[PDB]
Subunit: 105 residues, 2 copies
């Protein structure tokens, strides 16, 4: 379902264990009200799509991974296929989230 | 110079002590590399303009004030005149920062 990332090691290895699957990462934070509003739809998507991997990084716990991926706005969704970043956008837009997933799967 | 805000009380009272002056607030965070890149220009502006008040809120310490002002991206600058928010933008753009200050002074 949604995998909670708590280190750079786990981020790196999960992208390595994903194989050829799409990985969608949600960069969220506690003070972000839109990030709270979209957490249930984010979790529903992981159950709807079994062949996509869904990760969550709270920028406050993983400030290193947050600076590396150059997160600007809350929430940000970055999309990875074989360790290459293939997409990214900011904002809690549910249609575009699922729309981009269906584009990169 | 740049006043460090560490509570909702200090945010509220500084906007109250500003009187009729412009207050520019910098919503920053530790993991934000652009927020680091623009901190010296932010501090230079407080010395250049003695008749404007310059505040800094780190969103990680003041998560309440951060949710209330509905901060989305790092950094955000919100502009206040007599407690009314008169402007806001996101991004570490130095010309627009100073350009908006000269517009609302």
């Amino acid at each position: 379902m949604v995998k909670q990332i708590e280190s750079k090691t786990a981020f790196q290895e999960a992208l390595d264990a994903a194989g050829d699957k799409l990985v969608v990462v949600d960069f969220s934070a506690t003070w972000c009200g839109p990030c709270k509003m979209i957490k249930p739809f984010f979790h529903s998507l992981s159950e709807k799509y079994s062949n996509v991997i869904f990760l969550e990084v709270d920028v406050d716990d993983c400030q290193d991974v947050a600076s590396e991926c150059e997160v600007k706005c809350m929430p940000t969704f970055q999309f990875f296929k074989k360790g290459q970043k293939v997409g990214e956008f900011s904002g809690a837009n549910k249609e575009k989230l699922e729309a981009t997933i269906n584009e990169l799967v």
